[PDB]
Chains A and B, each alone.
Chain A
Amino acid sequence: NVTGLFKDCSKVITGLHPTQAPTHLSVDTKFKTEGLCVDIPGIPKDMTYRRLISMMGFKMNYQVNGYPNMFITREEAIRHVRAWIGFDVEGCHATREAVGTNLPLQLGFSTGVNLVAVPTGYVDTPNNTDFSRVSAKPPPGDQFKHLIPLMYKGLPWNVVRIKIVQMLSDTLKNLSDRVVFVLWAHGFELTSMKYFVKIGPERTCCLCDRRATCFSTASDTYACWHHSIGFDYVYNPFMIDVQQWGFTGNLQSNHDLYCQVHGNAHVASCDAIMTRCLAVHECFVKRVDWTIEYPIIGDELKINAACRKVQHMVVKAALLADKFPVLHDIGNPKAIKCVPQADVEWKFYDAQPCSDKAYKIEELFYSYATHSDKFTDGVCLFWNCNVDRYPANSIVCRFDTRVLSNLNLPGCDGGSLYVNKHAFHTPAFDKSAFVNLKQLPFFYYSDSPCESHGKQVVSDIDYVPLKSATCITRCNLGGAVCRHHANEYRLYLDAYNMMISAGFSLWVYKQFDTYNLWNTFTR
């Protein structure tokens, strides 16, 4: 048999002089005498011939000990989100001096970048091979008409590969230490990646210590993401084949199933975004795993501690304010009381009851469609759960998906994929859910003794001059300090601001009011 790899595309019919023919199948047949070759001095070697060499069907699945795999499995990809980047290419056919092969033209990534490159290909010469510019034309498909003007706007390839290294470098320098490309029509993209990729044994950066992901041909040196200026080769990408995962028709119809957000403006970045959106759906819109971990990049533990503090405070305050008989917890897979001591009846619900504590954790998938008229006693508590419109009694805390930060990564469909430890995927944000509630207004409830020295009451507890009207912590009157309460108020305010800047929004039943906390205070 044969393959299409290195399939010649020149239009001349005569074979090559054996001494300049790369293989035993690409010789001419006058020399072919019983599978062997005999030099016939009646004909000499040509001294001018320029045969384009198609570069498709590469097929790379080897096993060498020093070299890392290039196609990774599904689990090794799930672990390394943060590093996924879509990829799509558009093509063009060769015209006059050759025919039968495609050349890369427009490149598109998950970022909304679109590069165009002049058509270039690998030509031969009687002395060597050659990377030169060749003539081409767009595909005769009508929908591909938005490619006709692009054929005179190209760039020399070196500019393109430098731009690519730079775009990747400042997209990923603060997230991963690699890159994995998600792609669909695997073959042609692998073909295109001949232009700017180079593989080889694992290496570490120079003047930095992280693994190296860049190559420079001039100086012959590697680089990480940070220290990579002037370098023009990606040194060890990883890949993934989404269509390999058991999908049927074109990705357009497949994506069209769920995400109604990403339309199709006719470019390549659109295809890249759709591919990545689909890959995120296929692996993450399910239930969240607790065995997957992620490194911290960074500052995150502050956000976590802030969430702890604010949860404790808000729930304690709501209880002491209204004194609910029963606390209908919801969405808690670990029956752990947030406020530690609370005489209120404390339920636990979930749509995923654990093995143990299942007797505590009753199975329950909430939906306002049905359970709207069920828990009309006490109050619920939707900490980070994600349902439709919440019941008029609740204490919801829901992550807004519109904020920008390096922690949450775009997902489907409009909902984004938060990543702290174990990746949480949250649906799109909308207002219809909170039609029964109102934003929790800031406050600070304390209930404990005061400074000291005095350790009694009015008025021997140390006062400093804090004048704020919302630290509801009798002892307090305008001098309102008892040191303890004062710097505690400062700390908690800082924590609240950090939490609510990270993205989380709060809400409370409409009945809430602060004054009754003062009413509690009078002793």
Chain B
Amino acid sequence: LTNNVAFQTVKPGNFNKDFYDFAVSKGFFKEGSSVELKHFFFAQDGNAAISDYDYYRYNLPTMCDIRQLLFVVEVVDKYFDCYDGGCINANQVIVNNLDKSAGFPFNKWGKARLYYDSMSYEDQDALFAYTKR
């Protein structure tokens, strides 16, 4: 999209020295003990994002045994017959935290509050009806 590729890095964590001094004062973190420090804030260098997106190469085309699949799908469905579903109008959805990111390219002009707050119920129901075709 743009002329130069961005390289994103991941900074290290922050240290709470007072609590560490407390905990060693009360006799923790002994050598050879069982409880210890194993959970840290690992840092990453430049080509971190792409080196993790590359992990999709483990996804390969897979052909399934169609008959046994057509049976187990029925059994799985039977595991799921105590609930109730169906479409609902725009004026019945429940959004917790209307203040998260709105993906791209919409994140150039505000959070999800904007788009959930600038489209009347008619526009939302019209969008649903549109994607139904």
B-contacting residues of A (Cβ < 8 Å)?
A: 111-113, 115, 163, 166-167, 169-171, 404-406
Contacts of A163 in B (CB 8 A): 31-32
Q: Report the nearest B residue to A160, measured CB to CB.
A: B32
In the complex, chain B residues 26-62 whose Cβ is within 8 Å of any chain A Cβ: 26-27, 30-34
Contacts of A406 in B (CB 8 A): 25-27
**Among candidates A115, A170, A404, residue contacting B30 with C-beta atoms closer than 8 Å:** A170
Question: Does B27 contact A404, Cβ atoms closer than 8 Å?
Answer: yes
Give 7 closest A-B pairs by Cβ, nearest first: A166-B31, A404-B26, A167-B31, A113-B32, A167-B32, A163-B32, A170-B31
Question: Does B30 contact A167, Cβ atoms closer than 8 Å?
Answer: yes
**Among candidates B25, B32, B34, residue contacting A115 with C-beta atoms closer than 8 Å:** B32
Contacts of B26 in A (CB 8 A): 404-406
Contacts of A167 in B (CB 8 A): 30-33
Most buried by A among B26, B30, B34: B30
Query: 8 A-B contacts, Cβ less than 8 Å apart?
Result: A113-B32, A113-B33, A163-B31, A166-B31, A167-B33, A169-B31, A171-B30, A404-B26
* Given A113-B32, A171-B30, A405-B26, 10 further pairs, Cβ under 8 A: A111-B33, A113-B30, A115-B32, A163-B31, A163-B32, A166-B31, A166-B32, A167-B31, A170-B31, A171-B27
How many angstroms from the CA of A113 to the CA of B34 in the assembled complex? 7
A-contacting residues of B (Cβ < 8 Å)?
A: 25-27, 30-34
Contacts of A111 in B (CB 8 A): 30, 33
Q: Closest Cβ of chain B: how far from A415's Cβ, in Å?
A: 19
Contacts of B32 in A (CB 8 A): 113, 115, 163, 166-167
Q: Closest Cβ of chain A: how far from B44's Cβ, in Å?
A: 32
Q: Closest Cβ of chain B: how far from A298's Cβ, in Å?
A: 12
Q: Closest Cβ of chain B: how far from A120's Cβ, in Å?
A: 19
Contacts of A404 in B (CB 8 A): 26-27
How many angstroms from the CA of A112 to the CA of B33 in the assembled complex? 7
Contacts of B34 in A (CB 8 A): 112
How many angstroms from the CA of A167 to the CA of B30 in the assembled complex? 6
Q: Closest Cβ of chain B: how far from A172's Cβ, in Å?
A: 11
How many angstroms from the CA of A115 to the CA of B34 in the assembled complex? 11
How many angstroms from the CA of A169 to the CA of B30 in the assembled complex? 9
How many angstroms from the CA of A111 to the CA of B31 in the assembled complex? 10
Contacts of A171 in B (CB 8 A): 27, 30
How many angstroms from the CA of A115 to the CA of B30 in the assembled complex? 14
Q: Closest Cβ of chain B: how far from A418's Cβ, in Å?
A: 16
Q: Closest Cβ of chain B: how far from A218's Cβ, in Å?
A: 20
Contacts of A115 in B (CB 8 A): 32
Q: Closest Cβ of chain B: how far from A230's Cβ, in Å?
A: 13
How many angstroms from the CA of A429 to the CA of B27 in the assembled complex? 21
Q: Closest Cβ of chain B: how far from A287's Cβ, in Å?
A: 29
Contacts of B30 in A (CB 8 A): 111, 113, 167, 170-171
How many angstroms from the CA of A215 to the CA of B34 in the assembled complex? 26
Q: Closest Cβ of chain A: how far from B37's Cβ, in Å?
A: 14
Q: Report the nearest B residue to A168, measured CB to CB.
A: B31
Contacts of B31 in A (CB 8 A): 163, 166-167, 169-170
Q: Report the nearest A residue to B26, measured CB to CB.
A: A404
Q: Closest Cβ of chain A: how far from B11's Cβ, in Å?
A: 31
How many angstroms from the CA of A280 to the CA of B33 in the assembled complex? 23
How many angstroms from the CA of A404 to the CA of B27 in the assembled complex? 9
Q: Report the nearest B residue to A404, measured CB to CB.
A: B26
Q: Closest Cβ of chain A: how far from B27's Cβ, in Å?
A: 7
Contacts of A112 in B (CB 8 A): 33-34
How many angstroms from the CA of A17 to the CA of B18 in the assembled complex? 69
Q: Report the nearest A residue to B34, measured CB to CB.
A: A112
How many angstroms from the CA of A166 to the CA of B32 in the assembled complex? 8
Most buried by B among A115, A167, A170, A406: A170
Q: Report the nearest A residue to B28, measured CB to CB.
A: A404
Q: Closest Cβ of chain B: how far from A134's Cβ, in Å?
A: 25
How many angstroms from the CA of A406 to the CA of B30 in the assembled complex? 14
How many angstroms from the CA of A131 to the CA of B92 in the assembled complex? 79
How many angstroms from the CA of A513 to the CA of B77 in the assembled complex? 68
How many angstroms from the CA of A175 to the CA of B26 in the assembled complex? 13
How many angstroms from the CA of A169 to the CA of B25 in the assembled complex? 14
Q: Report the nearest A residue to B35, measured CB to CB.
A: A112
Contacts of A113 in B (CB 8 A): 30, 32-33
How many angstroms from the CA of A166 to the CA of B31 in the assembled complex? 6
Q: Report the nearest B residue to A406, measured CB to CB.
A: B27
Q: Report the nearest B residue to A405, measured CB to CB.
A: B26
How many angstroms from the CA of A220 to the CA of B27 in the assembled complex? 31
Q: Closest Cβ of chain A: how far from B80's Cβ, in Å?
A: 43
Contacts of A170 in B (CB 8 A): 30-31
How many angstroms from the CA of A404 to the CA of B26 in the assembled complex? 6
Q: Closest Cβ of chain A: how far from B1's Cβ, in Å?
A: 54
How many angstroms from the CA of A83 to the CA of B57 in the assembled complex? 59
How many angstroms from the CA of A308 to the CA of B120 in the assembled complex? 73
Q: Report the nearest B residue to A113, measured CB to CB.
A: B32
Q: Closest Cβ of chain A: how far from B21's Cβ, in Å?
A: 13
How many angstroms from the CA of A189 to the CA of B46 in the assembled complex? 55
How many angstroms from the CA of A406 to the CA of B31 in the assembled complex? 17
Contacts of B27 in A (CB 8 A): 171, 404, 406
How many angstroms from the CA of A155 to the CA of B31 in the assembled complex? 16
How many angstroms from the CA of A406 to the CA of B26 in the assembled complex? 7
How many angstroms from the CA of A406 to the CA of B25 in the assembled complex? 8
Contacts of B33 in A (CB 8 A): 111-113, 167
How many angstroms from the CA of A111 to the CA of B35 in the assembled complex? 12
Q: Closest Cβ of chain A: how far from B97's Cβ, in Å?
A: 39
Q: Closest Cβ of chain A: how far from B26's Cβ, in Å?
A: 4
